[PDB]
Each structure stands twice: as C-alpha cells, then as structure tokens.
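User: Please fill in residues for this 223-position structure.
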C-alpha cells in the first residue's frame, strides 16, 4: 500500500501536525463532515493517482454508471488523435486504463482495484494516460482555457501536464474533470487563520470524489 493507503480514521492525521493550533482546529472541523481518509504517495503524481482510484472506487456495483463511463473511455483515443498524439505512442497507456475500467465491471472488488493502483507499473501507466488526456482536452479547447494561464497553451501542456511528477493547479483539475465527466470537491487546509473551505468542479454538481489539499498534496476523503 505504498502508493494508495488503507482507510484510516480522519483524526489519525492530527499527528502529522502536532502543537499547531490552526491545523488542529481545521482537522477537528473536517472530522464533523468526513469519517475516513486514504493517503497517497507524494511523488508529484498524487492528483491524478487519487482522482483515478477514488472515482473508479465510487463506480463499484453501479452497472448503468459503469456502462456509460466505459462508452466515454472508448472514445478518448479520438480526443488524443485530434490533439496531434500518435496512436502507437499512446496505445500502451490507453490499454492500461481501459483494463482497469473492465476490472471495475467484471471483478468489482475494492481489494483488486487497490492492488492495480499499488502496482507501480500499472498505476504509473494509468497516471501517464490521464496526463495525456488532460493535455489533449486543453489543446483541443485552447480558446476556452487561455484564461487560467507558460504564456502559450502549447508550452504549458508540454511542461506542466504531460511529464510525470509535474504538479497540478486549477486548469488541470478543471480539464480532467471535464474530459471524463467526473464531479469532484476539493477541501483546502492551509496554515492561515481562515475558514475551512472547498471548491466544486463543476460549480453546480453533486460530487463523486472528495479530496483534501494540504502541504501541496492531495489525499482522498470519505463523507
Ligand atoms: C500531489 C503530490 O504528489 N504532491 C507532492 C507531495 C507531498 C507530500 C506532502 C506532505 C506529506 C507527504 C507528501
């Protein structure tokens, strides 16, 4: 469980910031709305790895939702082609993502999905696929995404989306959310004496996924 941990009680993360009055206050508050947390490895890939595991976990046992999601995933090679990616360069990464979607449909267990996301090879192939699809979705809508941002859209995707270990901002979150129709809520826990607060992507949606952002790092929350 070195990439995505077991579930733990929400108050188990007090020990990560002992004798820090603001962190203690905000974690206590968070515990009133959320029961449990899973931790991710902090390797620069945590947003992609967390979003993928948590969203696919949320599908388990939901046959119409899984069918509709698989239909969208089967079309994603066209997004990549339209942005200038070549099929022989993305095939290995697309096949790894399609394989874990089929595991959600056919096996259906938490334990099998956790095993794939803790297998360094399978899990890093999955993250690289998600980074290429984020890039493609931004490139194909450059006039729409100009406004979050490298001056050039193209330079930004080359440097800050496609490479492994590159950190995210609101543009990557919004783009991957839109590319896969995943509704997500991000809770923000910083060191300033401010309200605990959150953002929903997109604004009007009922989220599937809840993440905790603290110390430039994303962990998974359970409501
Ligand atoms: C998303 C990601 O991989 N971020 C890097 C990090 C980190 C981190 C912060 C606090 C504790 C452990 C890891």
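Assistant: Residues filled in for all 223 positions:
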């Amino acid at each position: 469980f070195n990439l995505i941990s077991e579930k733990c009680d929400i108050l188990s993360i007090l020990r990560d910031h002992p004798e820090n009055r603001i962190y203690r206050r905000k974690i206590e508050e968070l515990s009133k709305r959320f029961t449990a947390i899973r931790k991710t490895k902090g390797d620069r890939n945590c947003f992609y790895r967390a979003l993928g595991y948590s969203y696919l976990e949320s599908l388990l046992g939901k046959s119409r939702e899984i069918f509709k999601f698989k239909e969208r995933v089967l079309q994603t090679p066209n997004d990549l082609l339209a942005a200038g990616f070549e099929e022989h360069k993305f095939r290995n990464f697309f096949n790894a993502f399609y394989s874990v979607v089929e595991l959600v449909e056919k096996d259906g267990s938490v334990s099998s999905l956790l095993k794939v996301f803790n297998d360094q090879s399978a899990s890093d192939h999955i993250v690289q696929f998600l980074r290429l699809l984020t890039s493609a979705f931004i490139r194909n809508r450059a006039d729409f995404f100009r406004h979050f941002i490298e001056m050039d859209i193209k330079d930004f995707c080359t440097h800050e989306v496609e490479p492994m270990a590159t950190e995210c901002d609101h543009i990557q979150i919004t783009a991957l959310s839109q590319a896969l129709s995943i509704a997500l809520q991000v809770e923000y826990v910083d060191e300033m004496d401010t309200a605990l607060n959150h953002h929903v992507f997109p604004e009007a949606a009922t989220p599937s996924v809840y993440l905790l952002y603290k110390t430039s790092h994303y962990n998974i929350l359970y409501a």
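For context: The longest strand covers residues 209-214.
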